[PDB]
Design an enzyme around this catalytic site. Structure first.
Site, PDB file in Angstrom:
ATOM      1  N   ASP A  35       0.632  -1.247   0.119  1.00 24.84           N
ATOM      2  CA  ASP A  35       0.118   0.012  -0.053  1.00 24.84           C
ATOM      3  C   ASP A  35       0.843   1.114  -0.027  1.00 24.84           C
ATOM      4  O   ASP A  35       1.424   1.757   0.903  1.00 24.84           O
ATOM      5  CB  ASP A  35      -0.864   0.016   1.148  1.00 24.84           C
ATOM      6  CG  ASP A  35      -1.893   1.023   1.227  1.00 24.84           C
ATOM      7  OD1 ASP A  35      -1.917   1.840   0.379  1.00 24.84           O
ATOM      8  OD2 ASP A  35      -2.479   1.478   2.272  1.00 24.84           O
ATOM      9  N   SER A 199      -0.510  15.627 -11.967  1.00 30.24           N
ATOM     10  CA  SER A 199      -0.755  15.245 -13.535  1.00 30.24           C
ATOM     11  C   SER A 199      -0.987  16.381 -14.229  1.00 30.24           C
ATOM     12  O   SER A 199      -1.555  17.502 -13.660  1.00 30.24           O
ATOM     13  CB  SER A 199      -2.007  14.240 -13.478  1.00 30.24           C
ATOM     14  OG  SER A 199      -2.426  14.172 -14.757  1.00 30.24           O
TER      15      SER A 199
END
Length: 330
Positions: A35, A199
């Site tokens: 994770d 992004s």
């Protein structure tokens, strides 16, 4: 040193991935959920409330000659999906795909929430976010990666998640045969303890690319792709019959639909998520309403590049003094 381990989807939807991890002496192999959005290595154990164990493999520290109680230490964590676990702490030897860490904090669960009990395939979590998020008290503990870093050939690990198929976690090296083209690296903020990046935009299907900054985290422990409501609305508007269902808890679409791809920007580069990756199947057995793999982050407080996004790429988690993230197509 290096390590290399295969990671395997837990079910036919890729709801999560498990990776075998050797704990203790002799080795006890547990299948853990790696994770990159948390920083605790915790396991089902001989200490876990018996009624809360249902099919998981447990770690028994008393059977490990290298286990030592970390005196006074406790841990307690809650995840973004509302699940939780807590317990005490041992140090022990932990190996992943041939890479060994001695003295690793192994957080032994005394309590786990129903979500964990109900998932027989996941024996615990292995956190790979920054150690500043580790919940051990009163002495915060380091992640497996942090402990291994100095010994690694290169201070990196990579995630190569499969679509409906196994993939790979590598430590200490970049497998240049595992991706196409080049790796594009992008800046990371560690201020919230996550692999947080920006992004450069998105496209829906064959649509034009929208240049826009989207701050989010690279999180292997989250199944889906969570993005701003504007972005998510633009995607599902291209799917006939798709709608946001408050009763179901997100966007659903007719199972008869063909889903468009979703592209996200990494610098000047582009990662394409095929439409099939965005299908998470019937909302309930036999339903013709299917659950979408792109969902709104509104009310999460953060955008999350989860498995839906990451499995479309070869992803480099670069833990150099100034961390960065790399993405390649594959």
């Amino acid at each position: 040193s290096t390590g290399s381990a295969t990671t395997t989807p837990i079910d036919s939807l890729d709801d999560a991935y498990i990776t075998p991890v050797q704990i203790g002496t002799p080795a006890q192999t547990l299948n853990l959920d790696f994770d990159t959005g948390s920083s605790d290595l915790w396991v089902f154990s001989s200490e876990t409330t018996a009624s809360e164990v249902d099919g998981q493999t447990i770690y028994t520290p008393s059977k490990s000659t290298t286990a030592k109680l970390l005196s006074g230490a406790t841990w307690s964590i809650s995840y973004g999906d509302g699940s939780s676990s807590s317990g005490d702490v041992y140090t022990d030897t932990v190996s992943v795909g041939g890479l060994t860490v001695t003295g690793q904090a192994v957080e032994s669960a005394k309590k786990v929430s129903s979500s964990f009990t109900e998932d027989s395939t996941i024996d615990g979590l292995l956190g790979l976010a920054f150690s500043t998020l580790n919940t051990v008290s009163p002495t915060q503990q380091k992640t497996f990666f942090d402990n291994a870093k100095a010994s690694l050939d290169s201070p990196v690990f990579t995630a190569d998640l499969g679509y409906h198929a196994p993939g790979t976690y590598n430590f200490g090296f970049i497998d240049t045969t595992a991706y196409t083209g080049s790796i594009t690296y992008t800046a990371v903020s560690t201020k919230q303890g996550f692999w947080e990046w920006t992004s450069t935009g998105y496209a829906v299907g064959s649509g034009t690319f929208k240049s826009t900054s989207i701050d989010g985290i690279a999180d292997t422990g989250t199944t889906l792709l969570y993005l701003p409501a504007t972005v998510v609305s633009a995607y599902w508007a291209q799917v006939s019959g798709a709608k946001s269902s408050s009763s179901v808890g997100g966007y659903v679409f007719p199972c008869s639909a063909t889903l468009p791809s979703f592209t996200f920007g990494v610098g000047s580069a582009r990662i394409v998520i095929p439409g099939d990756y965005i299908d998470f199947g019937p909302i309930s057995t036999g339903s013709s309403s299917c659950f979408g793999g792109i969902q709104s982050s509104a009310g999460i407080g953060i955008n999350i590049f989860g498995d839906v996004a990451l499995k479309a790429a070869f992803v480099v988690f670069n833990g150099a003094t100034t961390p960065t993230l790399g993405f390649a197509s594959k």
